[PDB]
Amino acid sequence: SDPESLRWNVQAELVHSRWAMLGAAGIFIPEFLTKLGILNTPSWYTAGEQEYFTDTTTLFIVELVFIGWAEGRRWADILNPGCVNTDPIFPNNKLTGTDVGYPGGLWFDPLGWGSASPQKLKELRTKEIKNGRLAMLAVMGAWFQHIYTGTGPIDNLFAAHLADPHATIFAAFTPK
Amino acid sequence: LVDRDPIKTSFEQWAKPGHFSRTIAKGPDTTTWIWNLHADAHDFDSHTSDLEEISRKVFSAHFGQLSIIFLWLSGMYFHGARFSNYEAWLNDPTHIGPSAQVVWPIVGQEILNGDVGGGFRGIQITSGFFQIWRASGITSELQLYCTAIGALVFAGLMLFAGWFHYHKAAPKLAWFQDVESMLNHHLAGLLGLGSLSWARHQVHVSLPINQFLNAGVDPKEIPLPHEFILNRDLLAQLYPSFAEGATPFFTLNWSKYADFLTFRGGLDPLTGGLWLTDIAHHHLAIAILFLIAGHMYRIKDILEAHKGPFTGQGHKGLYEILTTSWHAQLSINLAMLGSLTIVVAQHMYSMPPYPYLATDYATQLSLFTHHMWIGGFLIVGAAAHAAIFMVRDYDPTTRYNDLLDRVLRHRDAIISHLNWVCIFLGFHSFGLYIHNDTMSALGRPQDMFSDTAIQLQPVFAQWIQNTHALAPGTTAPGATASTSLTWGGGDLVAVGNKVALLPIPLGTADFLVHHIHAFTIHVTVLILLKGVLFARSSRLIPDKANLGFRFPCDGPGRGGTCQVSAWDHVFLGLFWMYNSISVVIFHFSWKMQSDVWGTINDQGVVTHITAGNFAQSSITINGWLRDFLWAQASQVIQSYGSSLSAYGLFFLGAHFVWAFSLMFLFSGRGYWQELIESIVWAHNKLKVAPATQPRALSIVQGRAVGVTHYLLGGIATTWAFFLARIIAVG
Amino acid sequence: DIAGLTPCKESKQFAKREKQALKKLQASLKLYADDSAPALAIKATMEKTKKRFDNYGKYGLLCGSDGLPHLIVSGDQRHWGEFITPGILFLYIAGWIGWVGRSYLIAIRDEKKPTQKEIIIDVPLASSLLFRGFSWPVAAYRELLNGELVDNNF
Amino acid sequence: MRDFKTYLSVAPVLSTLWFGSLAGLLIEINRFFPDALTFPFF
Amino acid sequence: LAEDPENLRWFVQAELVNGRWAMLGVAGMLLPEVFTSIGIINVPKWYAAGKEEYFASSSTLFVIEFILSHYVEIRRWQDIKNPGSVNQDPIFKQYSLPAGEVGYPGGIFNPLNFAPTLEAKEKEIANGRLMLAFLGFIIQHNVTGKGPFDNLLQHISDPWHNTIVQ
Ligand code: CLA
Ligand code: CLA
Ligand SMILES: CC(=CC=C/C(C)=C/C=C/C=C(C)/C=C/C=C(C)/C=C/C1=C(C)CCCC1(C)C)/C=C/C1=C(C)CCCC1(C)C
Ligand SMILES: CC(=CC=C/C(C)=C/C=C/C=C(C)\C=C\C=C(C)\C=C\C1=C(C)CCCC1(C)C)/C=C/C1=C(C)CCCC1(C)C
Ligand SMILES: CC1=C(C/C=C(\C)CCC[C@H](C)CCC[C@@H](C)CCCC(C)C)C(=O)c2ccccc2C1=O
């Protein structure tokens, strides 16, 4: 008769979202962009074809020293000061709560009108395409599936097989 | 409760200490209520003082069994499929030795996985799929892989019928509280329309697809996935497309036939699973009845009728409250369901109904003891729940002066007899054996009770067995052999790998087990009978229906005043039955191998797993560990480093778990309290205990953790003891 | 070295175990997998207990008669970490089981009605008092015996 | 969404997603090192 | 009760001794790196004096020194239950007398003090750790290695090595 059913962070799920998704931006347009036959070709010789490999797992380290740094700073002062104990304001804390952060300390604040209001108008822009980005990428992340599963010949694994017409993979279009 | 009752919250009850009688789980902390909660979780003296719901729950939380039996079976069809051995075994039976399960070689594991047939590593089976599965008017591994999801289909759906009850706003009273039709339906068309429907898919398809299997081929060199339609052309080999008959009746001519059936009895030479040319006819000949039968009726009338002098005035009226009980109409059932399961356990071993059983020894005795512990674990129950009636179920006393009010009238009486019955037995029914020891260890055989010393003379024969295998010359039509090959008269030739069934002789060492059963079956029942009877009132305590059918024990007075009750009569009645069944098992295999199971070769000089050692030597009750327990079991205690090994390697635990029961069975209670504090003390010093007042076991919980263990101990012990002396020689 | 025999560098009795026993494993002249892709005695299960050759590492490891290996651990000749190495390990792991036992416990008995908060769990595992254990340098080895759990509270 | 001074609850047996698993990851160390009986160190 | 800490004395002095000995420990290494060539364990002996006798042994050496370290150390004890060390620049620091806005108890966070001219035990704070965790570092990497930094020919780029031990 209808589920009971949740939330409350019902308020937070929505901000790894704008994380996950905006993000898929990075993959969506650069791929297809790629640049068909640019002129063409993809060749990367440079730091890469002669200095004994370049990355992979020095890859990650350097690679997400940064993501490191920044992804942390991301949610853990998104906002929340007050930052300790001890009775309920809910989110699972707002144990920042009634105090934002400081009683007349510094400029905790951005912007006049005693709050943080990045002004009133802009529902526009990002309500739309952006929690789009959430939606969009559901289906061209459901393309990731279509785009490659079928492990282009070069392997049948656990042999059912299980019938046979012809191949599959990606580049755009479809026979139909 | 109290919480929001109203009308005024969908908002569900997640959070606020307790529920279940009313100075309930109290604010104040404790542990007992965590075995409370699970125990008695299902019960009815709480939930509401008003029938209504309960039947509205039990018709739902029922459901999730079927659905389950249904998630189960799937992982068994799947399993009996892609974890194959079934394909391999079928082209190649007499030969294989089947599997479905296999480990994954993590840690020690693998030893458990040991070459089983059509060329692979795994752990065997004594659960005769691969043999219902003969059936498959089709064959194919991925196929069972449809029967399989066909299973998960029935489930999710035959499990959303349980959403589609209680949780959905439910039916009510009339619906069940009009009973008027129920069996009308059930037996007519399902009981019927299955057995019926089973007929149609038991000659259509199966018969033919093992009519010409019982020879050779490799499947798909036979039985396509459709092939068996309109094409009534292969049905040509296995009788006419009725040729000139039209819908039975008589203006029919046979100058040479009589439709499929042409009744058998005996056993296929090449697949002694009993004939199938019959198996249609018998299911057909069922259903009809059910088909005709489930057509009563509407109730009282028939029971409101035949009374007499001493007979049952209350016979007439034998329960309005048999539409208003459950606990009653469950307990009745269990006695039948239960007692109607272990009647399986015979007609099976002395009349196999599946291709390749008997030859398959271990893959139908497992059976005959699994089926055997239900036709018993369901019967003590079938008493418990009557006790549950006898104490409470009805509102007041509206039920009066009848068949019962009668039986009770005598009660220090029906159980007055029965008692002496047992000590008459016991003395004629066990010390009987003890004679032997005392006098064969004294040693003077002249005077034992041997199948040969005390007067009986090289024959048993003249009774009724010998007028069974020989009855195809009465009103009997006939059909070579009997009904069950194990009967006195005629025939031999049964099977070309190993053996199957043959006569099975008697006299003494068959005479007296058969009697220990009596005395064992009887004193079991004494304690359940007197238990359920004296349910509510007595001249040790009359103020004795005042809590429930459990209650620990009334109190140190009256002398003893402890066991009493009837949870407990259904606690010491399990205690016996564990024997009742545990010694009946002990019986069958020692016979069935001492004689029967054994084996042909030239001149079919028969060679039993044991040249009948039974003879003169079960009669001694040591012979029962000379010839049994110490003889066989030498396969359990040799079983290390092998493939089965998981048995020997259980047989120590579970032969431990039992020898842990006694601690739960044999001990006080403010004991483990008195102890649990010393503990609770040391706890507080570090500051580590109080919250959730740790407490010892709830007098009768304690008995709950006896018993249950004593059985899952004392039982799998043999479940191991067994699978380890039929796998491997036998 | 000590009462049993010497390690792996030589242990005759031990050798015979390697060999019969396992390898009989063999035992199946064939049993069909000429090329076939399942039945894995064949590869490892042996070789994973087997390629465990005249190497097992080398571990010292004393090996008595029948050459099943015995554990001394008296902290000498070679055998030290057959108890201590995996001993302090048992200590450190437990104690940081119950350091937090005496923690997602000593954090409750207060505020408002705290009478079974524990049949549900406030922070699962405690996931707050969590690391207090690896975040034990020294810890109870001082603050247990001085203050808090202080003889007072004793 | 969880900051400082204890958090949100959990069920009766989340121990059955703690016996199974965590512990379960440990066979996962008992095949990476498919063997023990002493141990090299790091 | 003792709400909370505490401590004090305690293990703030706990540290500084780590700090300032991890600092020294690394003077240890300092040596073999510029005009380089000579170290690792090098299980010294450790610098070794004259050509007039030792000779492998004359004596346990090593073993002694620290019998000494030993009553000097009872001495720093011989201080911290009851404050006695003229300078007085560890136990809180010097700047004689003071800091002990934490010597009679009641801290919570208490930052501290202690140079007359001038500034602090502070940016001797963080050489304080750089070196404790450095060691962590230092006899981290042996257990496979022992040397730093050439140029851009073919060194600083990590080429091929060899697990952990395993
Ligand atoms: C048609 C049958 C069936 C049904 C629907 C019921 C239903 C009921 N019975 Mg019942 N009963 C039955 C057959 C049935 N019984 C049989 C055959 C017996 C004979 C043993 C009994 C003996 C019995 C007693 C003595 C009692 C009931 C009670 C009840 C009521 C309590 C239910 C409950 O809380 O679950 C109880 C189940 C548990 C709490 C789970 C514990 C199960 C343990 C013991 C495990 C079993 C061992 C197994 C190997 C362990 C799993 C494997 C492990 C090693 C991993 C309920 C109305 C109780 C009552 O008070 O009436 C209102 C009373 O206790 N029954
Ligand atoms: C966090 C818990 C905790 C702690 C610190 C202790 C500590 C102690 N117990 Mg103990 N105990 C516990 C839980 C605990 N117990 C539980 C749950 C039981 C089952 C009733 C017992 C049953 C028990 C008995 C019978 C005895 C002790 C004894 C003792 C003392 C001896 C230690 C020993 O060798 O037993 C080893 C510890 C056990 C057998 C306990 C098993 C339970 C452990 C694994 C708890 C693990 C944490 C648990 C999951 C909590 C959840 C975490 C939560 C924060 C989210 C010691 C003071 C002995 C004593 O009184 O002498 C001083 C005595 O013999 N205990
Ligand atoms: C719906 C249907 C049906 C059917 C059919 C059916 C409905 C069938 C069924 C059957 C059933 C059966 C056949 C049963 C079975 C059972 C089983 C198999 C079980 C077994 C067991 C035992 C023995 C005990 C317990 C355990 C187990 C479970 C294992 C149909 C309907 C109809 C209609 C209306 C329309 C037209 C057509 C028709 C057709 C006329
Ligand atoms: C010691 C042990 C165990 C033992 C055990 C033993 C020593 C025994 C056991 C047993 C069990 C059982 C036993 C269960 C079960 C089961 C089953 C599954 C059954 C089945 C069956 C049926 C179906 C019915 C009847 C028959 C039979 C039984 C077959 C353990 C220990 C431990 C430790 C150290 C610590 C931690 C935890 C652990 C890890 C835990
Ligand atoms: C031994 C014995 C006891 C003592 C038995 C006890 C106390 C068993 C209960 C022990 C519980 C089951 C331990 C539960 C603790 C764990 C569930 C907590 C930690 C959770 C896990 C992660 C380990 C009785 O209480 C008793 C009562 C009546 C008749 C006979 C006896 C009897 O024989």
Side-chain angles (χ1 to χ4, degrees), chain A residues 1-48 50-176, chain B residues 1-199 201-297 299-730, chain C, chain D residues 1-38 40-42, chain E residues 1-7 9-166:
Chain A
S1 66
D2 247 70
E4 44 179 89
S5 197
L6 88 198
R7 275 43 105 137
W8 187 0
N9 266 359
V10 147
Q11 228 73 59
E13 269 177 21
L14 83 97
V15 169
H16 79 272
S17 189
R18 186 233 241 184
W19 267 94
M21 286 134 292
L22 148 187
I27 212 56
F28 79 54
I29 203 39
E31 235 138 333
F32 2 56
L33 220 73
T34 26
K35 47 226 345 175
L36 194 131
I38 321 68
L39 298 217
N40 92 133
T41 248
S43 109
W44 145 84
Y45 107 86
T46 189
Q50 225 19 316
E51 271 327 74
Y52 255 119
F53 290 12
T54 352
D55 290 36
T56 41
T57 146
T58 62
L59 190 299
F60 251 73
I61 66 158
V62 269
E63 141 110 330
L64 323 99
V65 338
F66 44 19
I67 306 334
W69 205 79
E71 286 215 29
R73 304 320 161 100
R74 225 263 129 69
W75 219 4
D77 225 43
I78 39 163
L79 196 38
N80 47 193
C83 219
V84 285
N85 337 353
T86 172
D87 232 42
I89 307 180
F90 74 75
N92 149 276
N93 216 247
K94 214 88 268 84
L95 279 33
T96 125
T98 210
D99 164 72
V100 182
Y102 223 130
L106 206 85
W107 304 51
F108 32 54
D109 85 294
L111 322 140
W113 305 290
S115 252
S117 162
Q119 266 324 85
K120 307 291 145 178
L121 291 304
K122 37 203 246 300
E123 265 277 77
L124 29 145
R125 306 144 125 187
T126 126
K127 198 307 125 47
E128 199 21 43
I129 97 149
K130 263 163 198 147
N131 185 91
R133 286 300 70 44
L134 209 180
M136 175 299 135
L137 299 135
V139 308
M140 311 191 306
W143 300 29
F144 191 179
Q145 247 70 333
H146 171 206
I147 333 180
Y148 76 156
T149 321
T151 48
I154 12 287
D155 141 76
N156 143 264
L157 188 84
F158 66 166
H161 238 37
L162 245 198
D164 257 299
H166 240 54
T168 281
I169 19 152
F170 128 52
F173 194 21
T174 187
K176 211 70 289 284
Chain B
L1 196 354
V2 79
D3 192 283
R4 0 286 227 147
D5 194 35
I7 200 314
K8 290 195 126 147
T9 184
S10 180
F11 254 148
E12 187 65 333
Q13 268 204 223
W14 255 220
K16 265 296 144 153
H19 168 264
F20 99 129
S21 186
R22 258 280 319 147
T23 300
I24 343 156
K26 26 217 69 211
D29 46 0
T30 341
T31 200
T32 337
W33 285 248
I34 292 175
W35 278 293
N36 313 359
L37 180 162
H38 311 258
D40 103 341
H42 327 145
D43 146 76
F44 318 119
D45 193 306
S46 288
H47 261 102
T48 219
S49 136
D50 320 282
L51 18 114
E52 332 260 338
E53 40 155 297
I54 71 198
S55 40
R56 296 155 211 168
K57 157 191 139 74
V58 327
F59 158 91
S60 298
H62 247 245
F63 265 165
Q65 199 77 268
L66 311 325
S67 189
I68 234 96
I69 311 170
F70 273 138
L71 208 93
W72 194 85
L73 307 152
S74 216
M76 212 76 67
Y77 276 94
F78 176 117
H79 282 241
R82 205 102 195 91
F83 310 39
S84 198
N85 220 232
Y86 168 68
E87 228 91 344
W89 160 107
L90 62 90
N91 185 123
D92 302 297
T94 226
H95 322 312
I96 300 320
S99 206
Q101 177 165 19
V102 153
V103 281
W104 265 148
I106 33 88
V107 283
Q109 259 181 42
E110 210 304 281
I111 198 100
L112 255 296
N113 247 173
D115 262 40
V116 349
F120 76 82
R121 66 208 250 12
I123 192 51
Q124 196 117 152
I125 304 279
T126 78
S127 178
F129 283 85
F130 262 66
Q131 258 150 288
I132 294 145
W133 261 335
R134 283 324 304 222
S136 41
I138 197 181
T139 47
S140 291
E141 295 183 61
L142 272 37
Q143 84 185 23
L144 263 26
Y145 182 120
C146 330
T147 116
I149 313 155
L152 192 118
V153 301
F154 287 41
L157 257 254
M158 186 164 199
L159 190 269
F160 249 129
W163 190 101
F164 197 65
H165 299 326
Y166 206 87
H167 300 291
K168 77 93 98 70
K172 249 209 272 210
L173 263 322
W175 204 86
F176 67 113
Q177 207 50 145
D178 272 288
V179 163
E180 316 218 5
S181 84
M182 210 177 280
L183 331 84
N184 286 242
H185 265 113
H186 280 101
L187 93 137
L190 168 138
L191 285 286
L193 266 132
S195 160
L196 197 278
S197 210
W198 186 248
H201 199 264
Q202 215 192 209
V203 89
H204 285 33
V205 319
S206 65
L207 253 113
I209 265 72
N210 63 244
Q211 206 91 177
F212 85 141
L213 213 181
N214 300 12
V217 299
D218 354 292
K220 153 64 119 179
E221 216 287 333
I222 47 290
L224 282 78
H226 315 93
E227 223 46 32
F228 15 20
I229 171 220
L230 255 182
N231 337 75
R232 48 164 161 104
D233 147 72
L234 270 332
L235 225 287
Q237 260 62 278
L238 189 59
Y239 294 106
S241 263
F242 58 46
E244 271 171 29
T247 311
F249 298 84
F250 62 109
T251 318
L252 269 171
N253 202 256
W254 295 327
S255 168
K256 205 157 63 254
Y257 86 74
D259 277 339
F260 304 80
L261 48 139
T262 322
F263 196 131
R264 283 301 349 100
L267 304 284
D268 292 276
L270 262 273
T271 316
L274 181 149
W275 318 65
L276 337 92
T277 144
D278 8 9
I279 215 39
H281 190 337
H282 162 247
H283 291 205
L284 231 198
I286 306 297
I288 240 215
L289 171 181
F290 283 172
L291 285 165
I292 218 186
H295 273 144
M296 309 144 18
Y297 215 58
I299 45 196
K300 173 136 121 221
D301 285 5
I302 303 138
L303 177 190
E304 217 233 340
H306 36 350
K307 167 228 197 172
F310 73 65
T311 352
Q313 139 87 247
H315 217 174
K316 273 165 41 224
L318 207 178
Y319 274 60
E320 277 161 66
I321 283 170
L322 244 186
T323 68
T324 334
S325 27
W326 288 112
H327 276 250
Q329 229 314 301
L330 82 76
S331 162
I332 174 55
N333 169 127
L334 267 80
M336 299 310 314
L337 181 37
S339 194
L340 219 149
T341 97
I342 68 86
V343 284
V344 183
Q346 275 89 327
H347 299 12
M348 202 92 142
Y349 82 127
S350 150
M351 263 147 359
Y354 301 123
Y356 336 95
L357 301 157
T359 18
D360 200 23
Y361 302 106
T363 349
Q364 119 296 12
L365 82 113
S366 55
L367 270 314
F368 162 68
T369 122
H370 171 279
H371 300 126
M372 202 34 147
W373 283 128
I374 261 253
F377 248 101
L378 217 69
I379 313 263
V380 354
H385 271 285
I388 308 177
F389 179 111
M390 205 68 62
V391 177
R392 169 259 13 270
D393 49 73
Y394 18 29
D395 196 291
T397 71
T398 17
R399 81 231 138 113
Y400 316 96
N401 296 64
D402 81 280
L403 253 184
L404 211 65
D405 332 73
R406 250 140 274 242
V407 359
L408 286 50
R409 253 158 176 60
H410 60 355
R411 130 236 217 223
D412 342 74
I414 299 174
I415 282 47
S416 144
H417 298 69
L418 207 228
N419 208 76
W420 150 90
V421 177
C422 308
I423 49 89
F424 148 80
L425 301 155
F427 273 43
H428 305 76
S429 188
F430 151 52
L432 185 72
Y433 282 124
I434 225 160
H435 190 231
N436 303 197
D437 302 66
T438 335
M439 239 191 41
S440 162
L442 280 184
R444 261 290 316 292
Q446 311 233 39
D447 284 315
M448 187 132 71
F449 231 99
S450 325
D451 240 337
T452 150
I454 222 74
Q455 302 327 336
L456 280 311
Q457 300 62 268
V459 73
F460 355 100
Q462 173 53 114
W463 200 273
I464 79 105
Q465 161 181 314
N466 219 62
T467 119
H468 261 208
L470 224 229
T474 46
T475 95
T480 62
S482 277
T483 280
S484 148
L485 192 42
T486 91
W487 290 343
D491 184 285
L492 332 97
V493 225
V495 127
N497 186 314
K498 280 150 199 180
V499 154
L501 18 66
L502 48 21
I504 145 168
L506 308 106
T508 150
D510 214 332
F511 189 165
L512 60 242
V513 175
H514 265 272
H515 266 110
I516 192 61
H517 291 295
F519 151 91
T520 337
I521 311 209
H522 296 126
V523 348
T524 313
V525 112
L526 155 23
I527 37 207
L528 299 108
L529 193 11
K530 152 277 223 58
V532 303
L533 238 199
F534 275 71
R536 30 197 291 94
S537 306
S538 195
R539 50 178 76 281
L540 201 266
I541 329 90
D543 207 293
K544 201 213 100 39
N546 46 349
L547 18 66
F549 109 114
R550 289 141 322 88
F551 83 104
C553 66
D554 191 3
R558 294 151 205 162
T561 324
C562 253
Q563 211 72 140
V564 312
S565 176
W567 189 80
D568 302 316
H569 291 235
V570 185
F571 166 102
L572 336 194
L574 277 169
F575 284 147
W576 271 75
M577 91 73 167
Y578 158 84
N579 256 155
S580 322
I581 319 290
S582 200
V583 76
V584 153
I585 260 86
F586 265 3
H587 190 236
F588 165 86
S589 50
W590 192 6
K591 264 278 276 191
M592 203 53 49
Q593 289 160 336
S594 152
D595 332 278
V596 194
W597 306 336
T599 191
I600 201 158
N601 82 117
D602 87 72
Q603 164 108 233
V605 275
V606 68
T607 304
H608 300 114
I609 348 211
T610 135
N613 66 124
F614 223 110
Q616 254 286 192
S617 5
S618 338
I619 50 108
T620 199
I621 213 150
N622 190 344
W624 272 91
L625 57 317
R626 120 68 146 179
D627 297 298
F628 213 72
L629 269 111
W630 188 71
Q632 40 254 258
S634 337
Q635 254 102 14
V636 326
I637 58 61
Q638 249 49 298
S639 157
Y640 275 43
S642 310
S643 177
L644 73 180
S645 135
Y647 291 115
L649 203 259
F650 258 67
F651 197 116
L652 276 297
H655 207 333
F656 148 144
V657 98
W658 184 83
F660 160 105
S661 342
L662 300 181
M663 140 147 157
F664 261 131
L665 302 165
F666 280 10
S667 174
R669 201 268 128 207
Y671 173 84
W672 301 79
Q673 269 311 264
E674 275 185 356
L675 213 255
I676 225 174
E677 167 55 274
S678 297
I679 325 253
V680 145
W681 177 83
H683 292 296
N684 268 79
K685 274 280 201 205
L686 319 163
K687 333 217 96 165
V688 315
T692 277
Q693 306 288 106
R695 237 81 150 17
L697 280 59
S698 347
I699 299 244
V700 21
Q701 189 191 355
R703 312 211 206 94
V705 247
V707 212
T708 262
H709 276 80
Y710 206 95
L711 313 164
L712 100 160
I715 301 172
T717 16
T718 294
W719 171 70
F721 170 34
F722 259 111
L723 335 164
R725 186 87 271 235
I726 11 91
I727 332 170
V729 173
Chain C
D1 295 275
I2 310 206
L5 178 83
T6 47
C8 351
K9 78 105 56 157
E10 206 284 5
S11 71
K12 102 229 278 170
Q13 228 319 304
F14 193 171
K16 277 224 164 177
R17 273 33 285 200
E18 269 250 341
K19 280 141 123 176
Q20 186 319 125
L22 294 63
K23 281 345 180 146
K24 242 63 352 196
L25 254 93
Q26 227 326 34
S28 352
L29 212 103
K30 39 149 186 202
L31 252 236
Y32 46 106
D34 199 341
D35 58 300
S36 289
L40 213 54
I42 81 162
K43 318 306 101 92
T45 282
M46 43 206 300
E47 166 198 10
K48 86 96 120 148
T49 50
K50 263 208 188 286
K51 216 78 78 77
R52 265 43 220 102
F53 256 126
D54 43 282
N55 85 97
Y56 271 87
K58 252 167 92 47
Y59 287 45
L61 246 102
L62 285 304
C63 322
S65 49
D66 209 4
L68 291 326
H70 293 210
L71 17 147
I72 276 71
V73 78
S74 281
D76 46 322
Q77 196 295 136
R78 279 300 99 157
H79 342 96
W80 317 63
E82 279 157 4
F83 230 84
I84 314 319
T85 303
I88 313 229
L89 211 49
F90 190 96
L91 270 333
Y92 175 124
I93 271 93
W96 104 326
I97 297 321
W99 183 235
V100 342
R102 191 229 47 115
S103 69
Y104 178 164
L105 269 175
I106 336 188
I108 130 186
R109 65 189 60 181
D110 321 62
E111 209 252 52
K112 282 81 173 74
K113 202 83 219 311
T115 12
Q116 268 143 165
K117 286 277 160 157
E118 320 84 51
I119 99 160
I120 51 97
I121 45 201
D122 189 295
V123 248
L125 297 169
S127 182
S128 38
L129 306 138
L130 71 155
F131 269 86
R132 263 292 302 105
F134 194 112
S135 212
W136 121 29
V138 230
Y141 267 157
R142 307 258 114 282
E143 157 99 85
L144 160 74
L145 305 190
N146 335 134
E148 189 162 313
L149 216 169
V150 46
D151 217 316
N152 314 171
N153 135 162
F154 144 96
Chain D
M1 67 151 159
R2 273 142 222 312
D3 224 26
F4 229 99
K5 266 214 151 253
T6 71
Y7 293 159
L8 259 72
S9 341
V10 147
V13 226
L14 275 224
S15 287
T16 31
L17 263 296
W18 183 246
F19 141 52
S21 282
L22 202 96
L25 283 139
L26 175 164
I27 285 138
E28 273 310 282
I29 199 85
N30 195 39
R31 68 194 268 255
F32 166 107
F33 305 122
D35 257 278
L37 223 86
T38 303
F41 34 105
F42 323 100
Chain E
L1 55 105
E3 290 28 290
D4 262 30
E6 243 141 15
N7 91 16
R9 78 148 208 319
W10 147 249
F11 300 16
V12 151
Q13 198 106 347
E15 210 138 65
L16 95 98
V17 204
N18 287 106
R20 225 97 56 155
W21 255 327
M23 260 134 138
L24 284 85
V26 344
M29 160 293 273
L30 201 250
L31 73 139
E33 251 144 44
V34 201
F35 34 36
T36 54
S37 333
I38 252 210
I40 303 193
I41 56 188
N42 186 194
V43 63
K45 265 167 109 46
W46 81 148
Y47 154 31
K51 289 177 264 70
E52 279 309 342
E53 48 125 43
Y54 251 27
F55 197 129
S57 276
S58 331
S59 277
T60 175
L61 309 275
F62 149 12
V63 141
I64 267 131
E65 136 135 67
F66 311 35
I67 298 108
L68 217 137
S69 60
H70 163 14
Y71 39 79
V72 118
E73 310 157 33
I74 5 282
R75 140 244 89 218
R76 160 141 139 282
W77 197 286
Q78 252 191 192
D79 175 8
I80 38 50
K81 186 267 158 212
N82 287 334
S85 48
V86 65
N87 262 22
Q88 305 161 300
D89 338 359
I91 325 91
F92 68 136
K93 272 111 201 218
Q94 187 212 298
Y95 213 100
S96 264
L97 137 142
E101 62 190 349
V102 94
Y104 177 74
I108 278 59
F109 71 112
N110 262 178
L112 275 146
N113 184 34
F114 300 133
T117 251
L118 88 315
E119 272 218 352
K121 73 203 95 110
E122 7 170 288
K123 272 316 253 135
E124 301 212 282
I125 37 193
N127 325 19
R129 118 214 327 141
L130 214 245
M131 338 258 82
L132 36 65
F134 232 173
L135 176 108
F137 164 100
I138 260 145
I139 91 153
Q140 255 336 267
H141 281 134
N142 178 310
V143 215
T144 174
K146 47 75 226 64
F149 328 132
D150 202 304
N151 252 47
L152 193 85
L153 312 81
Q154 187 175 110
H155 156 27
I156 67 104
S157 30
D158 320 348
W160 78 333
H161 234 3
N162 67 6
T163 257
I164 295 76
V165 128
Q166 261 293 55

